[PDB]
Every structure is written in C-alpha cells, then in structure tokens.
C-alpha cells in the first residue's frame, strides 16, 4: 500500500505550532522545523473520512463514548502487542501528561520522591516539579559502545523513599525499545521497594524492524498490578490536534483515584472528532501505519548514511523506535549555547536542544524524521551548512 509520503504539504496555513511557534523558542520563525513531535504527513485516509462523516452530521453537542470506542483500543492492544486488557480498566484523558499529573497528585503526597531516567521527554521532569513532588533522576547509562541502557545499580542506590517511577517505553529521545529482560529487571526493583510504575508508552506503535514493543504491564500479573499505562493514537497517527489518550489501570483502587480526579476537574468527554478518529485509526489505520513505518525506516537509514558520509564528526545510533533521531554534536567542540546559535543563525533549522532533556543531553540534538524525504534532505543540508 502506498500513501504518497513524498508529497510536500505546506503547513503555513495549518495553525501548526511546529511551523508557527518557533519565535518564542528560537528567536525567529524563519527556520526549517524538525523539532516538535508531530508529522508533516497527512493523516490516514480512514481518519480523514471518519472526520468527514462526523462533520457532515452538522451538530456538535455533548459527546457520548460508545462501547465501540474502548473496544477498538482493547482490540488494538491485543492484536498489536499481544496484551489482553479489560475495557473496564480504561480512563479517557485529553493527553498523557494531564493523566500523569493527576496520578502524581492522587498517588503521592507533597514532597514525595518520584524517579525518572534522563535524558527524557522534558515534561516528565516538569510534571513532578509543578506538582511539588521531589524529582529523583537516575540517568540512563551511555555505554562505551555508544548505546543506552538503564543504570540499575544507580536506580537501586536512589530508590529509598521513592513512591513512583515514570518509565518512558519506547524512551524519547534516545530511541530505546526496552527488551522484556530489561523491563523485568526494572519491574522487580520496583516491586521489591513498593514503587508503582507509570509507564508512558505513547510511542508504542512506532517500532522499527527487528524490534518489538513490550508493555511493562503485560509481562506478568504482578507487574500488571503494579503498573499504570498511558497510550494514545496521537503519536502513531499524527492526530495530537484532536486530543485523545487513555490510561490503563488494572488496579481498581488506582482506577477510582484517577476517575475521581477527572471528576474533580470535570474532564470526562472526548470532543466529537477525537471520538471518531480514535476508533477509525485503530480499526482501519493498520495498513497506513505499516506503510508509514516503512517510509520512516527508509528516512532513518538515509539520514544516518548522509550524516556518516557528509558530517562524519557527528555520531548517531539508529533508533529502535520513535521517529526521532538523537545526534551527538559534541566532537565539534562547541558549547551547547554555541551549537544552538549556529543551528538557528547559520543553518536556519530548528532541532530540539539536547540539554532540554536533562542529564546526559548536553551536546546532542533531536531531529524529527516524520517528514517527506525532500524536507529531510533539506534539513540535513542546513545542518551541514551550520557546522561548516
């Protein structure tokens, strides 16, 4: 199946933050954007048509969540991940960080310790601080072979009095898809220390060849009981603007706490478009997704070949998942400030600064590869210009 991912789709009129909010961040908007994790691709045709059908009803009042909605999510998790859940475990949230934010408030008290692994998605750090909890960072270990693993010894050394661990699986920005054995080793630590895991698995569908997503909660019943899982159609199908995610809570007590938190802030219903797009994506979007992954892996291979051939001082490992590339610029001898400056000023390209991801980010930049080949090539040429 072919969906014309090579097509240029200008988003200058698309009310896109990727294309329109670069001034606050970079000091100008006149840059090639490769930062924000959404895609410069059209949504799957089944999504577009589900929106069309809903639009053409012409009444946009309060929206009910039919059984078919959560059924689509149960069926997806089983057929894609071999993880059987119950529809009764699912809670709607407009996004992952909102859900994690309410969980932190309900599952811990002020100044309780919460652990994350850096470098990681920057909201993980801020959500803990903005809830007045104490952030404990166990940095991932970058091995001398250039790859990242969890630092299990460090996690043990820092685990005392920790109440929650936020796991990123696949891990953004480094692109790790954790193996079952890696997950088992972490989940055993947390079981032993009575630490509940919140697993952010939003990139669960964006997995490259020869890798497989394992939901942490899927590994065993003991892990299931000790893991809360956040997933969404939004990264997979490029529908973050529609606002749809879910939380899987196999423990009733946790379910009740989160449900009651959403009741307290009165955030319960999907918007009318999110509702139909989420079901359409999971029920009909598989073919588009497989095609997208083939296109993505080709972009990834192209970018790494380009960098190794044309920018050999840069260092990059191929990600196992996500569409995000994590590139080490440190051999240039520039400070993070100097590098940010040349990329913006000389390259005229917008990448996510490594240091924004916390410990272990210095010297790196994150590049979004979910864009047409031609745009990716332009981006790489601009980076080449920046550093030469």
Question: Is 265 one of the binding residues for a second copy (CB under 8 A)?
Answer: yes
- Give the list of residues 6+ apart from residue 67 with CB closer than 8 angstroms, or none: 87
Q: Is 312 annotated as a binding residue?
A: yes
Residue 304 CA: distances (Å) to CA of 35, 77, 81, 308: 18, 31, 28, 6
- 266 touching ligand PLP, by CB under 6 A: yes
- Site map (CB under 6 A) of ligand PLP, residues 106-125, x = contact: ---------------x----
- ∠ CA 186-234-279, nearest 5°, is 110
Environment class of 303 (CB within 10 Å of its CB; exposed 0-12, middle 13-18, buried 19+): buried
**Least distance between Cl ion and beta carbon 387 (Å):** 6
- Does 57 help bind a second copy (rule: CB under 8 A)? yes
- Give the angle subtended at the CA of 136 by the CAs of 131 and 142, to the nearest 5°: 130
Interatomic CA distance for residues 247 and 268, integer angstroms: 13
Give the Å distances, CA to CA, from 152 to 16, 33, 141.
Answer: 40, 36, 9
Q: Judged by CB under 8 A, does residue 97 bind a second copy?
A: yes
CA-based nearest residue to 194, from 125, 107, 133: 107
Residues 6+ apart with CB under 8 A from 176: 140, 148, 149, 170, 319, 320, 321
Q: Which of residues 161 and 338 has its CB atom nearest to Cl ion in the complex? A: 338
Site for a second copy in 58-77 (CB under 8 A): 58-64, 66
Q: Are 325 and 303 in contact (CB under 8 A)?
A: yes
Considering only residues 141 through 160, tell me which ones interact with Cl ion, judged by CB under 5 A: 147
Residue among 317, 310, 383 at smallest CA distance from 149: 317
What is d(CA 236, CA 213) in angstroms, rounded to the nearest whole number?
13
By CB under 6 A, name the one of 202, 207, 272, 300 that touches ligand PLP.
202
Compare residues 172 and 299 and give the one whose CB is closer to ligand PLP: 172
Q: Which of 222, 313, 318, 345 binds Cl ion (CB under 5 A)?
A: 313
Q: H or E element: which one contains 181?
A: helix 180-192
Binder of ligand PLP out of 172, 218, 227, 236 (CB under 6 A): 172
Q: Which of 34, 43, 115, 311 binds Cl ion (CB under 5 A)?
A: 311
State yes or no: 218 annotated in a binding site.
yes
Taking Cα atoms as reference points, which of 212, 159, 162, 208 lies closest to residue 182? 212
Nearest 5°: phi and psi at 90? Answer: -90, 135
Q: Which residue is nearest to ligand PLP (CB)?
A: 95
In the complex, minimum distance from the CB of residue 160 to ligand PLP, in angstroms, rounded to a whole number: 26
Please report whether residue 109 would count as binding a second copy according to CB under 8 A: no
Given 3, 42, 63, 95, the residue binding ligand PLP (CB under 6 A): 95
Contact (CB, 8 A) for 133 and 112: yes
Residue 366 CA to residue 354 CA, distance in Å, equals 7
Q: Under the criterion CB under 6 A, does residue 96 sit at the interface with ligand PLP?
A: yes
Write down the least CB distance from residue 312 to a second copy, Å: 33
Q: Which does 311 bind (CB under 5 to 8 A by kind): Cl ion, ligand PLP, a second copy, none?
A: Cl ion
Residue carrying the six token digits 């924000």? 36
If one asks whether residue 200 binds ligand PLP (CB under 6 A), the answer comes out as: yes
213 is in an annotated binding site: no
**Residue 15 found at the interface with a second copy (CB under 8 A):** yes
Nearer to Cl ion, 46 or 311 (CB): 311
Query: Binding site for pyridoxal 5'-phosphate: what residues are annotated?
Result: 62, 96-97, 121, 172, 203
Query: Binding site: what residues are annotated?
Result: 62, 96-97, 121, 172, 188, 193, 203, 218, 222, 312
- Binding residues (CB under 5 A) for Cl ion: these are 147, 311, 313
- Binding residues (CB under 6 A) for ligand PLP: these are 37, 95-97, 121, 168, 172, 200, 202, 232, 234-235, 240, 245, 266
- Binding residues (CB under 8 A) for a second copy: these are 9, 11, 13-18, 20-21, 36, 38-43, 47-48, 51-52, 54-55, 57-64, 66, 94-95, 97-98, 101-102, 123, 127, 130-131, 238-243, 260, 263-267, 269, 271-277
């Amino acid at each position: 199946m072919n969906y014309n991912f090579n097509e240029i789709v200008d988003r200058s009129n698309n009310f896109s933050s990727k294309w329109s909010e670069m001034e606050k961040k970079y000091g100008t908007n006149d840059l090639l954007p490769m930062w924000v994790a959404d895609m410069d691709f059209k949504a799957a045709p089944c999504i577009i048509d589900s929106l069309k059908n809903r639009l053409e009803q012409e009444i946009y009042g309060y929206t009910t969540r039919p059984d078919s909605y959560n059924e689509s999510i149960v069926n997806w998790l089983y057929r894609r991940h071999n993880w059987k859940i119950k529809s009764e475990w699912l809670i709607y949230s407009p996004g992952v960080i909102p859900a994690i934010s309410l969980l932190i408030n309900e599952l811990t008290k002020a100044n309780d310790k919460i652990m994350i692994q850096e470098p990681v998605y920057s909201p993980f750090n801020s959500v803990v601080k903005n809830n007045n909890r104490e952030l404990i960072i166990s940095p991932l270990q970058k091995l001398e072979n250039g790859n990242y693993i969890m630092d299990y010894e460090d996690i043990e050394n820092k685990i005392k009095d920790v109440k929650l661990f936020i796991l990123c699986n696949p891990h953004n920005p480094v692109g790790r898809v954790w193996t079952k054995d890696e997950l088992k080793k972490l989940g055993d630590i947390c079981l032993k220390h009575n630490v509940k895991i919140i697993s952010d698995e939003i990139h669960s569908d964006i997995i490259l060849k020869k890798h497989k997503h394992i939901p942490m909660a899927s590994i065993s019943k003991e892990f299931e009981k000790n893991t809360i899982t956040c997933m969404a159609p939004t990264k997979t199908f490029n529908i973050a603007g529609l606002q749809s995610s879910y939380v899987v809570l196999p423990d009733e007590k946790d379910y009740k706490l989160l449900d009651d938190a959403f009741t307290r802030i009165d955030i319960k219903r999907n918007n009318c478009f999110s509702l139909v797009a989420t079901e359409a994506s999971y029920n009909n979007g598989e073919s588009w997704l497989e095609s997208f992954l083939e296109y993505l892996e080709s972009n990834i291979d192209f970018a790494i070949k380009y960098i190794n051939e044309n920018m050999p001082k840069l260092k990059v490992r191929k990600p196992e998942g996500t569409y995000l590339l994590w590139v080490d610029f440190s051999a240039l001898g520039l400070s993070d400030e100097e590098l940010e400056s040349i990329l913006v000023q000389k390259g005229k390209v917008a990448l996510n600064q490594g240091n924004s991801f916390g410990i272990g980010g210095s010297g790196y930049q994150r590049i979004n590869l979910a864009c047409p080949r031609s745009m990716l090539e332009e981006a790489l040429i601009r980076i080449k210009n920046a550093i030469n």
